[PDB]
């Protein structure tokens, strides 16, 4: 609903009339898996010295 | 002219900024191959900035 300009008509342009807004993740271009199956992995290094 | 309007112009002529990738998901339809668009808009010759 945030709105991007009055039309005159006071109707309202919103972000729901220009695109479609989701709760998804910052970056699709990663994935990981355990085996065969999918998992998170967390990788540490190890601090120096 | 002004001293001021050579500045904003040199500021946004002379600038690299950022472009994305091409077929990079979410995407419905899968592409075979992610293409980065490059740019140069940094002008490295004088005359570039003539």
């Known amino acids: ?5 009055v039309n005159e ?13 989701e709760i998804g ?5 990663s994935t990981g898996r355990l085996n065969t199956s999918a998992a998170v ?3 540490i290094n190890l601090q120096s010295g | 002219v002004t001293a001021n309007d050579v ?5 946004d002529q002379n600038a690299q900024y950022a472009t994305g990738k091409i077929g ?3 995407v419905v339809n899968k592409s075979p191959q992610v293409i980065s668009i490059t740019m140069q808009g940094r002008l490295q ?6």
């Open chain 2, 24 to 26: 990079e998901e979410p």
């Open chain 1, 1 to 5: 609903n945030i709105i991007l300009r």
């Open chain 1, 9 to 21: 008509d006071k109707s309202f342009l919103r972000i729901k009339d220009v695109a479609k807004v």
């Open chain 2, 45 to 50: 010759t004088p005359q570039e900035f003539e």
């Open chain 2, 7 to 11: 500045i904003n112009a040199v500021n």
């Open chain 1, 25 to 29: 993740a910052e970056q699709y271009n």
């Open chain 1, 41 to 43: 992995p967390i990788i």
